[PDB]
Design a protein around this ligand. Structure first.
Ligand code: NI
Ligand code: NI
Ligand code: NI
Lengths: 133, 133, 133, 138, 138, 138
């Protein structure tokens, strides 16, 4: 069968791996993006200011990974929003909405027991390289 | 490269979005379905009767989204079952089994800390548009 | 449209299903693998020794499912690591690292409230059948 | 035999073009490519060449191709290659004046040359390849 | 050169059909499409035309195509287009009586016409295109 | 018309090969397959056959194909089928001696035969099919 493209996505505009994973993997046309915490890309540290600031940084991180793969947020087809606190759902929703102009992805969003580094939010995503009709 | 089909799936036979997401996204042949709670499609409210009733409604909701995309449960390849209580695993399993006549999907099933709206169960799914061999 | 290959993956070298799911589903070239606990394939029981032993068994289980589908760990593109305890992240990371020689998958890793059978870890994965470039 | 996708193979058949009598089809669509049998200036109803020589024949042949394309959900914009077979190379310019009426832009690849003889005494035969849309032209 | 999938390109080669001597292959499979070099009524063992004229030649040519299809994991049901080249248009009916024996249904697209000359003095040459299965016929 | 992928269809055009004047393109790339119009031994600059007979013409024709392949991001290793049309079957060996210079291994499928006449009085015309890489040869 055809040999499908498989490319590790890696940019210094997103945080370095603090464990055994790639930022994202592009395979054929689908990009599987690792869960992103609200880590400042230069320092590798959670940004201050709690869940809202962290959500903004996490989504910014995803945006830079998408850009490295020739995509933007319009390429995203599914996301998962992992919360440390379900009471933050409204606040996180309002952040998240700002990163999608259109064609809102499929999503699941819920509270887990704990995230790495005591993050308040982690977002994973799936995207498909364009062109998309 | 080819421009792949990307279609937002939306039916009034499933609940309206109470946040910034689509019910499902079809991209090429893969359908990414949002996490469904046991919400009555007409009202947008959780059905009464607890985890069993909610699981039935959530899976019914998924079925209507699949139908909107020209599919049924035989198109589903993976599901995730998110529980508010791991003690409900048996009861939810017996509900879930009724929606698959065959070719049971891959699955993961476990307890999270909280779901939106105080749901007792949420189910996400991945499907592939047929024909399938 | 073309009729895509859809094959239920099933091997006696991985645990039997204790519920209504397949070990994995191959659909076109993508393999959706069910969440694996650290269950001994012969007995269906969690191996003793806690999170480290369980992680090793879970990943071994995934390896046998990949082998049944003509793949190995280099085919994996995404994994999710579900922990019963976020303090086990380091220990689980060191186990997990041993199963990837290269091209580390995308990943998300975090603590949930409870796993089936009181497992300490569950790992799901997504793979793509080769050849991969 | 089941480890790769099963690709669509559709037999095209329309009463609006000469019937394909014997062990051939008017066209075969397979995956997205349509292979169209060479068409002569044969009248579908009569089973004979239309009168009036190479120009009338070219018109009927291209009409025939058009009806086959339509049966496959396509039109002339789907054509990516055509071969124009002639009884006389010196009829090329006159056949080209017919042919150019069917194409606007993004023209098919083409070969045109003279053969020793065509079926039915034909003076022109056109074979085409097309690709089922949608197509994005660059 | 690495940003798109690398498609399979397989050279077909079988001792059961005339050897392809010089810078050509008996057939090339690329992705799922098999392009088969035109086959004459050449005996594989002798390297010459079989005796007995156009009918014997057509049988050998189609036998040759069959062995090449088999080498590519296919049979005659995989064929989607064929071209029948003749030394004499008036041999069409007799060659067609041979050809029809190889196909049952879902027939290939076809063109048949007379050329000025074929290699080796041949009276018939058949070129075919096939698509590696599985195929779903509609 | 939007429920299947929209496949790329690219018109190939290069000044380095004879211009395609009238309702045809030098080549069409569609999905990954390139259909290349038959090329004569025509000088691009002059619009006429090069002098010196069939051997000089074959060289120019293959040079023409080369420039078209290059315009489509390909070279001769991308070619999967070619057809060699001749004014004289007895020129096959001499044209083959030219042709073999363009191919090293993994040769295209081929048909070669004599036609009654080619455009422009040509003695050789070559049509080719190619597939945009990357390609994995087995
Ligand atoms: Ni198969
Ligand atoms: Ni490339
Ligand atoms: Ni469409």
């Amino acid at each position: 069968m055809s040999s499908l493209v498989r490319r590790i996505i890696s940019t210094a505009k997103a945080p370095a791996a603090i464990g055994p994973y790639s930022q994202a993997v592009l395979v054929d046309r689908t990009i599987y993006i690792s869960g992103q915490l609200g880590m400042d890309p230069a320092s590798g540290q959670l940004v201050p200011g709690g869940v809202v600031e962290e959500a903004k940084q996490a989504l910014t991180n995803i945006g830079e990974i998408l850009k490295a793969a020739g995509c933007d947020f319009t390429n995203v087809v599914k996301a998962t929003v992992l919360l440390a606190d379900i009471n933050d759902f409204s606040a996180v929703n309002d952040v998240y909405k700002q990163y999608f102009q259109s064609s809102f992805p499929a999503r699941a969003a819920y509270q887990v027991a704990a995230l790495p580094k005591g993050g308040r939010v982690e977002i994973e995503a799936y995207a498909v390289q364009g062109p998309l009709t």
